[PDB]
Amino acid sequence: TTWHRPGWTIGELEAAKAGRTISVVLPALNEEATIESVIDSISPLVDGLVDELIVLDSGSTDDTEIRAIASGARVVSREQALPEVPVRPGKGEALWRSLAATSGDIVVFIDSDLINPHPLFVPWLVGPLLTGEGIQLVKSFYRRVTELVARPLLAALRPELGCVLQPLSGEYAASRELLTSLPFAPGYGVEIGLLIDTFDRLGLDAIAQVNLGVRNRPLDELGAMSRQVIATLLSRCGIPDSGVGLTQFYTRHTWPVSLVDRPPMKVMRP
Amino acid sequence: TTWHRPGWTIGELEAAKAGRTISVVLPALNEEATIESVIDSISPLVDGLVDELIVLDSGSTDDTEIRAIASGARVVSREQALPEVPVRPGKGEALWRSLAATSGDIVVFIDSDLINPHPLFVPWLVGPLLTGEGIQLVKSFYRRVTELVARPLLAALRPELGCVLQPLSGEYAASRELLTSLPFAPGYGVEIGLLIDTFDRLGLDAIAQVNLGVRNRPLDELGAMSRQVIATLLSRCGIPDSGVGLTQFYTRHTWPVSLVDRPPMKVMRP
Ligand SMILES: O=c1ccn([C@@H]2O[C@H](COP(=O)(O)OP(=O)(O)O)[C@@H](O)[C@H]2O)c(=O)[nH]1
Ligand SMILES: O=c1ccn([C@@H]2O[C@H](COP(=O)(O)OP(=O)(O)O)[C@@H](O)[C@H]2O)c(=O)[nH]1
Ligand SMILES: [Mg+2]
Ligand SMILES: [Mg+2]
């Protein structure tokens, strides 16, 4: 179901959580310009509704770590998250590793690139989870790879999902149980994979969708992001993807594409 | 092979044509603003290199027909092209019907929306056909659904084709033999279908690619165009496409998608 209008209060939400804990992950790669306002918008909730918040630094070479530390956030490196396993590039890798660095019964994911996030994003996302039943994933929407790639593709291969307005949204929450059960697609495939894998396994009903209000990058990427979105999506649907990277044109350049998911994190914690 | 630099002259090209005729099709739906300059850029060639040029009017309700008639072009309606078969919406329908209205051994397709086309487009497209051998299709490139949908998708499902810079280009030429052999995908699928169907059947070598120099619409469409591009492409690759139209969001709207190709025009002319 879909909440076009969120309206729980931090106090009632905190109430309804009934012993379950809530972690918050901000994945960040070189986001020094926005990282502070993102953290700051959520800071106050910590020790109340939110029990834990960390920044997953995916190898920033700018001032992201220091700015975030200055805003009172725990910063975890991909290496710190899971020391025993060498590190892979891409967003999916970081979201995956973040599971090992957190312990909330509920994990909320919020991108670090957001321009002045609303302080009610977390409580709005965590809404259906705390007050509903059998909701395990809640995606957000607001206001493109999403409108030209992901959404047409779902109409074609998983139309039951063509009602998701933002399949690729970086802002969503889920139970720890579901996320540890699932593989994690590499790079920019992670979001579309979790959507399909959750649907395929729990049905359209474990999935909520909430309005977050209102809302970038070069066509150089995007092409690349689109490619991986296609590979993850094709794979979840039983279509063999070639493995070949998108080539951009003179002169030539081939962006990397990965057909390798991470296993469910359950596996790694025996 | 790829001509990064075209350099035949109307006189030598005309020479090399050795009895083969050349038709030119401008499909047009409501293009009153550009139709004249497109025709005008090609007019002079008629009775020389080009033997026949027509405008395929796909039901314009503006002044396209009259402007084009005023520029000395034959205008054919979809109905006139093939009276005996009721008319379907979409670009593919019009390109298909145009085969019945022409008789050149070589058909050249040029979009009617082009801003001040170069007068050497036709001769550059028809180049490899007239002076090469075993080239049956030549696509153009210059300077997106193309960069986010069509091109990533070909990397994934027909990577041998990921070297085409403009899979979706509206400017291309082909032998009458090849085009009558092929089915024609509906609407905005027509281009991607002909590319795949030609490759699958004649190999990467019957296909040329020429530089045409240098170079629009709302994300409302595009979404829709992307969808049909996905359905035609999925179908050529043996993937069952759901048949479900892309739904846009409040409030709702579902754009049409077609899984129905036209049969090879050979069939219709017994
Ligand atoms: O290797 C990584 C690790 C993390 N992130 C982070 O994950 C989020 C999504 O990145 P992006 O904004 O580029 O995705 P988009 O919204 O552009 O599709 C951001 O907060 C990133 O810094 C990333 O893009 N790549
Ligand atoms: O039902 C039809 C019949 C013809 N055309 C024509 O075919 C070409 C391609 O249309 P468009 O420029 O919209 O394609 P785009 O380059 O935007 O992907 C144009 O000259 C159109 O007027 C069309 O789009 N739809
Ligand atoms: Mg982002
Ligand atoms: Mg056009």
Residue numbers in the entry:
A (entry chain A), B (entry chain A): 24 to 166, 185 to 256, 260 to 293, 303 to 323
What does the paper say about this structure?
In order to further understand the nucleotide and sugar specificity of this enzyme family, we have succeeded in obtaining the structure of the GpgS-UDP-phosphoglycerate ternary complex at 2.7 Å resolution and the ligands UDP, 3-phosphoglycerate and Mg2+ could be readily located in the electron density maps. The only significant structural changes occur in the loop connecting strand β8 and helix α9, where large movements of Asn260 and Arg256 are observed. The occupancy of the UDP and Mg2+ ion in the final structure is below unity, indicating that not all active sites are occupied by these ligands. Although with fractional occupancy in our crystal structure, the electron density clearly indicates that the UDP molecule binds in a hydrophobic cleft located in the Rossmann-like N-terminal subdomain of GpgS. The Mg2+ ion displays axial coordination to the oxygens (O1B and O1A) of the α- and β-phosphate groups and to Asp136 (OD2).
M. tuberculosis GpgS catalyzes the formation of glucosyl-phosphoglycerate, using an activated glucose donor and 3-phosphoglycerate. To investigate the structure and specificity of this novel glycosyltransferase family we have solved the crystal structure of M. tuberculosis GpgS, both unliganded and in complex with Mg2+, UDP and 3-phosphoglycerate. The structure of M. tuberculosis GpgS comprises a single globular domain with an overall conical shape, displaying an eight-stranded, predominantly parallel β/α/β sandwich. The structure can be subdivided into two closely associated subdomains, the N-terminal nucleotide binding subdomain (residues 45–137), composed of a four stranded β-sheet (β4, β3, β2, β5) flanked on either side by two α-helices and resembling the Rossmann-like fold, and the C-terminal subdomain (residues 138–281), consisting of a mixture of α/β secondary structure, usually highly variable in GTs with the GT-A fold, and shown to be involved in acceptor substrate recognition.
